Amino acid sequence: MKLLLFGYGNVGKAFRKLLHEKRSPELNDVIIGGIVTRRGIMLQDKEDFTPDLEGDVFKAFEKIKPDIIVDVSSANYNNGEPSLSLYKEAIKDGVNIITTNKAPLALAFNEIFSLARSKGVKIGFQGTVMSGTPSINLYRVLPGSRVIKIRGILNGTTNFILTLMNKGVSFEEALKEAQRRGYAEEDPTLDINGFDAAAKITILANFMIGNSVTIKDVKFEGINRDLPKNEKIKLIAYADEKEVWVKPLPISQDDPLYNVDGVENALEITTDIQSILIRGPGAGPVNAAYGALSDLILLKRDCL
Amino acid sequence: MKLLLFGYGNVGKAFRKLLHEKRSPELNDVIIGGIVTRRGIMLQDKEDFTPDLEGDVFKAFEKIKPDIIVDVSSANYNNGEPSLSLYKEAIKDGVNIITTNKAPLALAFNEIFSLARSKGVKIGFQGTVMSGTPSINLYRVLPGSRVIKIRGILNGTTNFILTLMNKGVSFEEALKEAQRRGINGFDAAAKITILANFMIGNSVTIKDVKFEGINRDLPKIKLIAYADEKEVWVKPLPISQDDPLYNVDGVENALEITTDIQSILIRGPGAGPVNAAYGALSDLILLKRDCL
Ligand SMILES: [Mg+2]
Ligand SMILES: [Mg+2]
């Protein structure tokens, strides 16, 4: 089982590590044919990235001919590239996709999944929502339930920030602390302007409801310190059959989301049978990589 | 695929209704070979139960020769019978089991599952713990992680009664108020036994659980089930405001799975006929997909 690993920051390295910890027998035949980053292509499975050749992901894909692409690269919300056209071409080749990269599914879910459905190709995408906390994969074990509405906290960075702000730390200081900790990048736009949460609710509305939505259809706002006096604020993502949105709201103590704090995330799934809530870490590179690994083993069991 | 439905109270009625609701392409070829109750054997798929033959689940097993036994009969916590010997005969014939009956698994998990593993037979058992809220099946989507500890609220009723007590409506009134919407912590004890066998690998039976139910004058207390490699117990505990279980009130279950990677918690409605039947139905589809 040959993997092409696209991306190698912290999530990529954590993925490589988990895989080599032999946590499952389904993973005995798994090889890393290559790893591709901004700095080139490494045709070897080593802990540190040293490129062997110049080139992008398309060149790597053509040279390696993997069985699976593991996509842990950064979300590009402008157009989803190069991941979007990379997924389309791989699926046509009967190449499976495992992704934590939100952008292509947030932009072109129906385009991706129809084509995957037509070619019998499997897409792991647990890592796109709530990292290693089953969200996509939770729904997989709820077959035949019809989802009515979803509601949750879907962004680790802004939750950690709004948690600190509830404790008397300023927006600015909670920002710098999220960055020192790695949860937020030097440019935290996607988190703080709410793109990330909006991407996630888009994916969930697509997969769980069956709404044919893109991130364009989502009315969203991020965080900024013009927020309510004496409230615990949460960046709430919502979707049903009719609407999908993300906004920071005052949370009351009776809400099952009130105490979902720090990098913790939660999802409330209301179905025709029941209303369930799941909670766990929303960020952390080990967590995100574990989402991808969960998909990998599931793919190996033919359970995607 | 031919089912034998064992039990036809509310859960079994709810399962038969769900199955014909055309919920999945996986369920297009599924037929009910027969339904068994304590009054006998109906060899037909109908809404109303009327016996075609007298005789027990063993006679029905022989007469129908099904592919799958769906067990939604009531828990017999004395000895797990007839389900426990039924399951053994089933597995030995290559017949899969989907169950909501806690008792056989709570009393003799290792005996059932060693047999099934050696014979290659899949068991669906989601409905035994937290009904239709993925618990057993949550851990199925957590592959390659090691479960260090479990914690939770595994009985809706006791949880609901405890909710009113701390709120003001103390033990006497809360007892009576509960019955209007309708205690020793036994039911949580069976559920935690199953969770400990499957997720931790502790070869526990119900007799190993140190369990105590609610008292009259509790000095926010919750009925808490817990397991790890060392211990399995159910104690009423005053729970800290920092707990993610603190807000789990009413007729609700919740489960905190702690692995080497992460700590996750799932919460849903406790136990109900449609919920319970949905757990069995989920397992059925999962089994059809070969994902058990
Ligand atoms: Mg190589
Ligand atoms: Mg485009």
Residue numbers in the entry:
A (entry chain A): 1 to 304
B (entry chain B): 1 to 182, 192 to 228, 232 to 304
Provide the authors' original text about this structure.
When overexpressed as an immature enzyme in the mesophilic bacterium Escherichia coli, recombinant homoserine dehydrogenase from the hyperthermophilic archaeon Sulfurisphaera tokodaii (StHSD) was markedly activated by heat treatment.
The immature enzyme was further purified using a Blue Sepharose column which is an affinity column for purification of enzymes requiring adenyl group-containing molecules, such as NAD(P)+ and ATP. The absence of NAD(P)+ from the purified enzyme was also confirmed by structural analysis of the immature enzyme. The structure of the immature apoenzyme was designated the IM structure. In the immature apoenzyme, the substrate-binding pocket assumes a more closed form than in the mature apoenzyme. Upon NAD(P)+ binding, the lid part interacts with the rigid part and changes its location substantially to form a hydrogen bond between E186 and R38. The distance between the rigid and lid parts within the IM structure (cyan in Fig. 6c) is larger than within the M structure (represented in pink in Fig. 6c). Heat treatment-induced conformational changes were more obvious in a region of residues 181–190 in the apo-form than those observed in the substrate analog-bound forms. All the structures obtained here had a disulfide bond between the C303 residues in the C-terminal regions of the two subunits.
